[model samples]
Target: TCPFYKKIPGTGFTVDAFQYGVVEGCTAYFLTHFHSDHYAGLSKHFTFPVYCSEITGNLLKNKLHVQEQYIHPLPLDTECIVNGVKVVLLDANHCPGAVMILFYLPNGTVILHTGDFRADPSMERSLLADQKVHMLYLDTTYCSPEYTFPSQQEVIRFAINTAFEAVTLNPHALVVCGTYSIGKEKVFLAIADVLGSKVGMSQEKYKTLQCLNIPEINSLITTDMCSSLVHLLPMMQINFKGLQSHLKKCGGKYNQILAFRPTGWTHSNKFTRIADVIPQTKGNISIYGIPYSEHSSYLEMKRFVQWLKPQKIIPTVNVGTWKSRSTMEKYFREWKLEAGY
Candidate 1:
């Protein structure tokens, strides 16, 4: 049920179900975020009422061009009753509009669906101390013990420092940070702010960020390709061949390229130091896989499980096999039993 895990059982609600358009036995469709994977199969011709965070609602209307009439924008940290089922949204901490959905089914089943979240201490403040969560539809993007990366603040500082050093080595070098459309804003924004490097990005991504409305980022954007030293690119263009193609597009202004590929997999081990992760190098290009993930690390997840103590856990992202499913079951079971439901 990796892909089929859209429907929340014991209720008529389906969470993030554009892929399985208008799933049978589901009343309202809830979108967790605006990421492509989560919002797949969605179109203007969609047939169901959609509910999500207001920011996500805007992105759905603006970016994906979905019809606004059927769209419902739910405010964060607020309760909204939909068809007798109590709904509340908590900040997911993963992306700009991402939310961890809390649902109280009419049958008294309390479900907490973490769409895609980074475990943060601030999250606990929004919950009642005695609220018992019945089911947890988890974002198992980094379910294994190996995904132990540093904090986002540390990674941003490290990235800024690394970019500063790289640019110091060659002032004309093009320093690029790979990012998704909605996530990883801090890395690029910090580099440009602290290092005062000019920012380069396509108009499309600029448009997307415009929707995000992060005030610190707008002033740093520049149009001239030759003017900017720091560039923000999508995830695919951080590799050697990707950088080579990008380099050829630019004139002789830039000598070499230094790209930062930031994700959890970049620093997926307990033994490795965060500073020592090596960069993939070739001629005129280097792609350093920085440990800058939006997902929760193994340690963070353990803590979250210790905090929430859900009665049941459902894996959403990486349950492609029975083995994978069972592993998460065991892990969730261990964490839950050690704590309590």
Candidate 2:
């Protein structure tokens, strides 16, 4: 049940009532970002209109193909009335399309929902103006002391330097970097920034970037008209053991393979698959293992909670990630805080 409002879960729900909800006829304001957790639920079972920023709108439109009419693109920090409630959007530096939303009522109650975010000084400064929030829904995904990461800029820098170093060792070898489409977009931009006009692009990525035309960044290569155009081998093309061996053998002046291994990939077999295919060339292959993450670390979350000073802090979902409820009770008892669902 949605506890933000007093509406009964069984019936009498309306779109104008709740701050955010999943049930029928309940008004919901989405604090969305590029992350799948917050956004995957939209259009799941209802056709309610979703509101976010213009950049988010374009990204969602192109990626998820959400209906055009249902998207309400609001400007950053501007107040807008939706279903009799005032809503404000703020920049969330977790992802490219991330936003932190403020839901303010006419009666003076204010709810600040922070979508997944990093505690970058710039982002914190932008969102600090909402000083008197009554309720704070924080993103405590990494609420543990063990988690930490470098800034996004540092990760990009590491990737670039590693790529260049690989190319320098073997001037004619192909450097293959692997990352998800959205995740690797920034990596490519960083590469382009370093390589400047000499940068190139893959055919598919270029077309996709062209259609979206995001203002913040653009692709290095925009056309397929030249024989000597800068080349970018798609990650999809390098799949399977056979193809991997073939590419390694065929690596030459025409194919400069640079593998991009983003930080924090040590937990899974995804990185292992790539490593198995193209065996590391001793010291020539540089694996930049900078920890770069979107979620807030335990210290960050604790600092944020202390700043807000809420009477109660609720974990939205347990899902085995959090310690047991009794352990949480002990924590609250020690910290003199309250907890809820």
Candidate 3:
């Protein structure tokens, strides 16, 4: 209830608001990415025009099977206006087709909708940095002092090295990488390439990846069974019972299971923030809970908030009846206020 994602007031446009079933009689619906949470309620049964990146547009048509005429693909960083609202799509730094939408409406009201993004230096010299934004709707997924981790590059290297070492020690170690869909592909891709191992994926999962058309990753994927050491599966199946069934089910190819469960959850109860992550070994099953996340951490989000200096930043996530959303609003207030002269 903190930040209503259904519709943006005064603009007559809703963002990823398909689940709400066309509220406010909006002119056009804006989709930031193809992630299921964001792209909910969109299907063959729909009305209203959709504005998104070309990649997202293609996914909407090919994967989701939305009508071709209704989906409108917009170029990134270019200014275009429909019904008096000037709009631009900035690279969202989270997923492949993800984007942060910029809306310049009539009466000088500027709104920047961050459809789930990771803070990067790319935005330093960006359209956002140049403009004086009025309202910022952000995906502050990790906006707390409790959640903090190392740089993405640092974590990437650590994961690669860990995978290499695990396989080096045990030649027949099955590197079971967890990815429900698209987030932790970087870790598995690097692991597969370094280990000189082909990656096995489910037929539909592999087919779905074709939408992105990432040649480098596409070339490394395989659909057949018992062909590769690295097998990508759902994050839920990385556990003991889940992986236990897999090892015996695979005929006799692999000796042990090494699961790389990459996630953003740094601490559970106690605040434990560190650079190097530890792995849990339950006999032959070694679970590496890598803190490699797509969302920016509390510290990283703090810097982005300070840099942008928006008049108001409303939360787009983590708002519940527990009133947890206000926890982030205070940090947003202090970080943005204390930055400038």
Candidate 4:
């Protein structure tokens, strides 16, 4: 019953059909990305013909064991017809194989679903040339001013520098870089290239990276923790308790351990000191949170809305929390005004 699924004025196709169950008269389903939240309740048992990027399609087949025939792969920037609607997939710049869905409807309306992406200049140029967006289903993950962080390139530079500096400070230190299972491959890959060392990742992550076939990235994946001076671990497992336990089990094999969590949460005022690396030590381990993120901040979102100029701005998340539609409308207007765009 949520507004996440939209029926194009004249077409029967639905975008991001999750938790809504099977719609009796729908023509087909379009998947924006492979994030778990976007694919909630989805599995190989799904009855509809699901379409997504080639990488996402491969993930569905290999990881979820979904039948190949049920999954359709769409290449970036190529327009394809599905159930009488013209659709184009554009790079989302969020994670590998993530894309933004652009639907050109029969009723002369264009619907754009920005599937969890960061704003990039190339994407802006491409979308602006189209000139009109009737409705926008937005990724409002960080829809607040406090979420402003540096660009991805800048953050990657800082992370690479930090890793080298940590190793230089303590020759016996083992640098542990924290990353999500999919999105933050760039950070670790850059670190490995700079340090001239291979990266150690879990077997699952190594396989996923192998599917990507990025020449520079594929050669860097290693399963042996002692394969390199620095190791890559899932972001969820980089916390205080997790690292403390890991250190205890290692039993003084390494003289020192340095941890880095690349995330947008470091932009908050509470973590200001930690981000600055003032004294940078949590117990015996050295730790820091880099201000890196894959979502558009409030400022970036405002700019996107102004450029696209959609008739309606729909929040893709937390739709059930609003008391009424009018409250949501009022909030968007106020946010746009304060954002000065």
Candidate 5:
């Protein structure tokens, strides 16, 4: 008897594994990363053994409030078994805890799931351990040949250069750059690295960086760091009135306040509206929009597919959308024909 099922017109099976409660019957459930798409189903459904990297486990435990009993944290480069299926969790280099999983079946069917991985040679060595993969679950988020993404280092340099220009051009203004909670941790670290003793981050920013576990690399002015640097009080920790008073007091002392938050400002269109609300820095706040992304580019995805030749490919998470699926299928067909697969 099926506990949950969604019948489709053409296919005999249910829409997805979760629909028929088939996820628990699978040999194992491998979470590619801690992103909402990859790890969203967990903590809500499927109480089976869910595997991830140690860091990812910690993230789910701390950020999402998931219990440790549901998580199976394993170190990278080590082979383990889940329900008799040989599995290996490899670092993806996308985020601190981001991972790529390889499932080796007893019948010599090896499937490599490239979960949102870029074409970083370092990661290729980890994923391609001299094994011929039978199936490849690819990341085709960006599948067009015309699209290209700047390297992480390049983006970091751009942000640094832009921040310097912003500070120099508008010495009396407050500068705010936008980034996501998961990916922007690196950006903050990059900023801290360049600024060194010159740049002063808020206590809240410093605390957030601590959660990432790259403390040695990040030199942001945290509560534990030096006291001379300017640390903006976190917005959540203070009320609107309190913020107004704090900004008013720091107006003459500090030149500019660099605030970093996710897409809340853009989503709500409160950039200008909220700036107007601030009493001390009214009309003086400059929102420098940065289009920094953590996902792999089209070229990166293509290169990854070429590296790991497989018999059949399965798309998952963000790449499983209808449009993306079609694009990927086309790419796969052409790629297969060219490679003689």
Candidate 6:
């Protein structure tokens, strides 16, 4: 029930829903980002005006083919009125155009829905200026303390260095870095700039990056497999069996393959940090899951909640029915009593 669309008590706006399952009678629909889970059930046939950032709007038009008239592009940090409610969109710092939505109801209730974002100091300062947040819909992806990971920038540095070292050690080896379709453009660009080489990418991935019109990335994309020593592949492609089969099919074009997966789950249980480089190898492929995450860690979440001091906290993930609220309360109680409230 959390991720599904819900109607604001006094306002006529719906958020993060493509269908009318949880709430109906919504005048406008607001999307925080274009991620599949957030945009689930959305299509060209969508009838309502969908509000999102400029880049997300373009993707809706180009990739999903949503009509331009129905796609409303909201500028970051700018206040707009929708159905008598004051609204402001803030940078989410998750992906290209993700946004954190702030809704101000007429009766003096302030609500914030953080789509999916890491802690941003500037954004935090901006929110602090607002003074009060009555309710908060949070992203609890890494809500548990066991999911500790280093900052993304630190992970990026380690990943790039490790990749270059692998390639240097084996001149005939190809370093393949795994990333989602839209996120982690910085990782690929950094490798390209540092290695002084073009990065090969799948046509679909290339098209997605091309749409962003980033100069650094635009100049590095190549369709040729053997043209570059580093290849940017989807995260799913880095599995041991997949890499083995792919290299086998290549007929010895490359003698070795090294894969890197920058993710927080790598050290969910064990103690690890950004400076540590742990490699897990299978057959001819060596894979390393670095600590790069786009969501807030448990400690970060605790700090964010304490700063905002929202009266109520609603989690975005499904935690089962009837027991959902109690479950989240207990989860937060472990951190602090005020957060559990």
TM-score of 5: 0.71
Candidate 1 vs candidate 4: the TM-score winner is 1
Reference-based lDDT, each prediction? 0.81, 0.53, 0.81, 0.74, 0.55, 0.76
lDDT of 1 by residue, 1-341 (tens): 22557777777888877775457777888998888988988888886789998889888888888898978988888778976788998889998989988888877888899999998777777863448888888888888887778888887877888888888888778888887768888877888876676688887887787787576565777655677888888798778878888888887788889888776675345677767667778977888777777899888988887887777777888778888888888888778677765
> Which consecutive 10 residues in model 6 have the weakest lDDT in total?
1-10
- Model 4 segments beyond 4 Å from truth? 2-9, 248-253, 266-280, 323-328, 334-341
Candidate 4 on 291-314: residue-level lDDT in tens?
677888667776777666677787
Higher-lDDT candidate of 3 and 6: 3
Q: Runs in model 5 with CA error above 4 Å?
A: 1-27, 44-47, 127-129, 168-175, 197-209, 217-283, 317-324
lDDT of 5 by residue, 11-87 (tens): 12221233334433354455656666456555633566556777777676766666777777888888786665577
Task: At residue 202, give the lDDT of candidate 3.
Answer: 89
Clashes of 4: 0
Give me the overall lDDT of model 3.
Answer: 0.81
Superposed by TM-score, candidate 6 places the C-alpha of residue 183 at a distance from the truth, in angstroms, of: 1.8
Q: Model 6: residues >4 Å from true position, as ranges?
A: 1-5, 21-23, 213-215, 248-253, 267-269, 321-325, 331-341
Worst 10 residues of 4 by lDDT: 270-279
Q: Write the per-residue lDDT of candidate 6 for residues 1-341, one digit (tens) a residue.
A: 43332555677777787754534567788888878878877888887888998888878888888999999897888889876778899988788888889998888989899988886656677854665888888887777657676677877788778777877877777777887757666776787767778888777777676666475665787887777777877788889887887777557878888887766565443664567566778767888776666788777777887777777777875445556556667776665575454
Please list the residue runs of candidate 2 whose C-alpha ends up more than 4 Å from where it truly belongs after superposition. Answer: 1-22, 29-31, 41-46, 197-256, 263-290, 316-341
Q: lDDT (0-100) at residue 319 of candidate 6?
A: 47
- When 1 and 4 are scored with lDDT, the better candidate is 1
Alpha-carbon deviation at 76 in model 1, angstroms: 0.2
Give the TM-score of each candidate. 0.92, 0.72, 0.92, 0.88, 0.71, 0.89
